[PDB]
């Protein structure tokens, strides 16, 4: 069991950046793969990124790579996720999610445990 909280939301200006992350309560969060996922109302919702247990592996949605970098902090239990050269296509409901199978946390069915979701709403 694990539970998540996203904070770091908010309103940006296209071009800029924004920082999330996302809190678990536990020290056992380590073990899961974490990863990023986002929802447009009325659409579908969509992967973002995701990273390993210990920090090795990460994927990104191929509409944000090379914009966007996740990471962790397995001390403080934080993932992050760093937004850059934000898009007006960037809005919507940004969801952290785990995963004890790191394969399976991009796959919409993937994983276990889901955040309520913090909202970005980029500008232009």
């Known amino acids: 069991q694990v539970q998540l909280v996203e904070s770091g939301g908010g309103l940006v200006q296209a071009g800029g950046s924004l920082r999330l992350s996302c809190a678990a309560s536990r020290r056992s969060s380590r073990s899961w793969a974490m990863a990023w996922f986002r929802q447009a109302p009325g659409k579908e919702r969509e992967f973002v990124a995701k990273?390993?247990?210990?920090?090795?592996?990460?994927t990104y949605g191929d509409s944000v790579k090379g914009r966007f970098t996740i990471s962790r902090d397995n001390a403080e239990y934080l993932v992050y996720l760093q937004m850059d050269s934000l898009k007006p296509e960037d809005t919507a409901v940004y969801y952290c999610?785990?995963?004890?199978?790191?394969?399976?946390?991009?796959?919409?069915?993937?994983?276990?445990?889901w955040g309520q979701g913090t909202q970005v709403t980029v500008s232009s």
């Open positions: 990273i390993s247990g210990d920090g090795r592996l990460t």
């Open positions: 999610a785990a995963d004890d199978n790191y394969v399976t946390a991009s796959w919409r069915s993937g994983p276990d445990y």
